Symmetry: C2
């Protein structure tokens, strides 16, 4: 059946709290390196991190923080945030990992979400940078509150070390992380370390790895899949600012080369962004021969994006098997599946193609064609300790090669959303099954995501019918919440105004007839040549936004 | 400012718990009449209601229910549901008011929402009809659970009367009701529900002589509170019909009003428009609607066209032209909190306010209705006694009158909160004791007028915008007569061209994307121009 177990995970081996992770890491000579620019870097050994964290701990306790208290992180500096995180670990304080707002001068969406979590956590101390404390302090006027408390981390780095680490238990909450209003994922040392240990075993991570990450530390893959995995293995890890990558994506290449990185990760959009620079890549020089692990996860992994990425960077020494698709969620401590089958020389390896007609039934393999076939990137087997299953509308187990609702069982699951019993019921189903909200199938024990529940009105059938209209070259439907309406994008064979209005009328009326919808339910939108796929360009727009 | 207090409401006056309400009602000879069909009915005096509720109480207590335990309601029959509700009041049990599922054979949205509530309430006994109990028991297979418990009301009607009522306190929970995503479980007390009853009775001057007619579901807050509980509190005669019977043949509404000489009734705006569809059948029928004095219209946007048409069409049948009363409320505030007494058949501008469509972002400017360039809204009236309404901007700052903003409510009718959801309770329970409704509107002369919902606003670059604000920028484009914009989630701007020609329409469509993308700093890809 569509139920895959990753095998036994011995979580008794190794550290049991994050304090023990930092202690064992501080015994190595490895640590962190924070990139400032192409020439300058700031180093912080794991031994220095421990002392720095103890210094910050002195200031936090001076502000009255007691073990169990939450701490609201609002950082632009990786150095200050990493240090602040471990100070909290030492003090038994619970960090709330959430990105800083794009601006603090007006009551925008990001600022509203921060207020919600801040109020849900009963007005916790906000910890931030010197470069942000002025902005963050403005929230006192935006929120019309006298309960705002802010403090910068850098001033604390000049304090005496507080060597009295609060004794933590594996089930103690280790941090909150934010996902409408965001929910407050509460994790323990046990759930995080279980993902770390599972991730290390599946990928064979070691203390000799060299890690490069520019993704936000407020993203679960930034904090757990990399930062904590790196400290747990005690390997060398290089941190870059997210802003610096999206400003100049080719810096990713420079960084992998300059530090001889062996592993890194990004969502699929970053790979597509690099592919947009083929001209300047074909006139550049990088040594990427040390890179062994480029994890691709957090959103849909597009086969043609990763293949082009491997092709473009092959002359620069990137082996064709470094890209590892992965899937995970903050609620399950980051990635729980990894695919080791993507190969530059085999576009079909680790990629599954099926007939569009069979999406609602037993999937029927096919050879990729211009139309009528869909290609999905396999995301691999569960890591040790994780069980995945695929279920139908009634939560009944499905067989393999059947698209259904993905559910996860294992030791990496959050304690739950903070202060929301009702939301915890929706996701925590009977017998330990966490409901992801994602759609996919299992094939040879390997998970493949195909969509989301919120992404439900079949869009392959709507597009096929739209393409029978003579004026339509190709089509793309997205659903859109007075009416539940589907917006039908199309390329006309001819971008002439009369021709477009004819095709638009036929699209509306031909879809209304063939599928028994109201013509009012279909909106036709007309859309040179672009090389980047449409699904890939929208990934880039939402990411850099 | 845009803040209106409805006046002081003496809550210490009158019954303080629903037990007291039924006891007083039972002293009258009035009660309920359940409509079976045109030629049949079942009657249940308030005294008989108390006795029937005492018998059901014997069955519920026989099932082990204790004071404070919830009870899941799944009813096709109003008589059984009303009796169950009061049996739970006598026993201190907390009914969970939710409509029956359209079908228990398949796993539809309704059944999922029931499981969520049922699970949230920790598997309460489900109380249902002997008619429906067969399908309800099917949830055991559909939900794949062995903890389901179901019982029928009717068999319990043969048991002895348990006259030992649990002593209730005003702040005890009196019932749960599900919101209309997954629904939330609104929890109310006798105090909050009775505060709304008392304010509503005072605003409308309801009395023991009213004759009430209601076909709306008792799982709707206006069905249980605004009418049923108001009617028991006033001790008046109330007629109950089944909701399906009305939808089957809407004109039965007129039949019932005529047959029972009803003085008050209610429905959402659609029901009035349903009747308007039947102009032909109404022109060849005969009703005496002269006793009707109060037709509440609420739960949806009140369309001036629909109500004024409705009034002209039933006037030959004796419907007075002032009977329709727009109203707004929410289950979280236990039903209506404003009533408008200004609608009139002979003056289609009374109780209605029209403005220049350009004055909507700042101080509204009154106007004379026009074919284009003006919008008109139905006033929903002053707060009932005890309620305070205010309008606020995106920073929760008070606004002046004639300004559109977020509507907030304060008063004694507010729920305890959403059951087992601290987070959602924070979102709606704002500082200074204000409840965030999620609706938009303005105050004018102390009267509330709604103009939209927050879920309808367009969010771009994390900033929020009204539909009309975008429309005014779109209007500036040459060749755009009028426009309407409706937010999209993956900006659908619908416009009328000055001249209907392909190239003329295509280029006005291009200047709408360029002019708005420029003025709002948005990606042209995000602007969809539809003619
Ligand atoms: C550490 C990373 C591997 C991922 C992660 O852990 C994360 O992304 O955490 P996040 O909570 O932020 O969001 C979770 C939601 O991202 C979606 N998602 C993640 N990976 C995906 C993939 N490979 N393909 C398609 N969709 C994917 C999914 O829908 C999921 O439920
Ligand atoms: C009159 C009461 C019995 C209605 C009621 O109490 C109810 O309708 O209960 P409900 O909680 O189910 O729904 C609440 C949501 O209905 C919307 N709503 C209600 N009345 C409205 C009106 N007059 N005009 C426009 N919208 C209205 C509003 O958005 C509100 O927040």
């Amino acid at each position: 059946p569509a139920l895959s177990y990753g095998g036994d995970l011995d979580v008794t081996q190794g550290a049991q709290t994050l304090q023990d992770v930092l202690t064992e890491a501080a015994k190595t000579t490895n640590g962190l390196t924070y990139i400032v620019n192409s020439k300058n870097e700031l180093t912080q050994s794991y031994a220095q991190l421990q002392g720095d964290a103890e210094r910050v701990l002195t200031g936090l306790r001076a502000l009255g923080l007691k073990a169990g208290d939450p701490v609201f992180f609002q950082f632009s500096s990786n150095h200050a945030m990493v240090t602040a995180f471990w100070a909290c670990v030492l003090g038994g304080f619970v960090p709330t990992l959430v990105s800083a707002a794009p601006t603090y001068r007006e009551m925008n969406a990001a600022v509203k979400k921060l207020h919600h979590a801040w109020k849900l956590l009963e007005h916790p101390l906000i910890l931030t940078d010197d470069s942000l404390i002025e902005e963050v302090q403005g929230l006192a006027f935006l929120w019309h509150t006298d309960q705002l408390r802010v403090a910068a981390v850098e001033p604390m780095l000049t304090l005496e070390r507080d060597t009295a680490a609060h004794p933590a238990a594996p089930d103690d909450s280790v941090f909150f992380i934010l996902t409408g209003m965001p929910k407050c994922v509460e994790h323990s040392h046990r759930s995080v370390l279980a993902n770390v240990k599972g991730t290390v075993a599946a990928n064979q991570f070691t203390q000799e790895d060299v890690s490069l990450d520019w993704m936000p530390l407020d993203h679960i893959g930034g904090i757990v899949m990399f930062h904590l995995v790196n400290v747990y293995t005690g390997c060398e890890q290089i941190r870059a600012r997210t802003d610096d990558f999206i400003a100049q994506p080719l810096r990713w290449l420079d960084w992998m080369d300059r530090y001889r990185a062996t592993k890194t990760w990004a969502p699929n959009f970053a790979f597509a962004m690099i592919n947009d620079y083929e001209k300047e890549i074909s006139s550049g020089s990088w040594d990427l021969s040390a890179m062994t692990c480029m994890i691709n996860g957090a959103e849909a992994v597009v086969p043609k994006t990763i293949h082009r990425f491997l092709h473009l960077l092959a002359p620069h020494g990137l082996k064709g098997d470094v890209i590892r698709p992965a899937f995970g969620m903050s609620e399950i401590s980051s990635a729980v599946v990894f695919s080791f089958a993507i190969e530059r020389g085999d576009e079909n390896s680790g990629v599954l193609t099926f007939e569009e007609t069979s999406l609602t039934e037993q999937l029927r393999p096919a050879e990729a064609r211009e139309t009528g076939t869909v290609s999905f990137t396999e995301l691999g087997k569960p890591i040790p300790g994780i069980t995945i299953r695929i279920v139908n509308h009634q939560h009944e187990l499905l067989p393999e090669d059947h698209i259904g609702r993905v559910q996860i069982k294992g030791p990496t699951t959050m304690k739950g959303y903070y202060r929301n019993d009702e939301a915890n019921q929706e996701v925590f189903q009977a017998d330990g099954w966490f409901h992801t909200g994602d759609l996919g199938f299992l094939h040879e024990g390997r998970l493949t995501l195909t969509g989301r529940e919120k992404d439900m009105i079949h869009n392959y059938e709507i597009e096929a019918i739209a393409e029978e209209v003579p004026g339509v070259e190709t089509s793309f439907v997205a659903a859109c919440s007075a009416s539940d309406e589907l917006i039908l994008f199309f390329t006309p064979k001819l971008y002439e105004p009369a021709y477009i209005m004819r095709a638009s009328q036929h699209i509306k009326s031909h879809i209304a007839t063939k599928m028994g919808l109201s013509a009012s339910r279909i909106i036709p939108v007309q859309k040179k040549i672009e090389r980047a796929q449409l699904k890939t360009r929208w990934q880039e727009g939402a990411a850099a936004e």
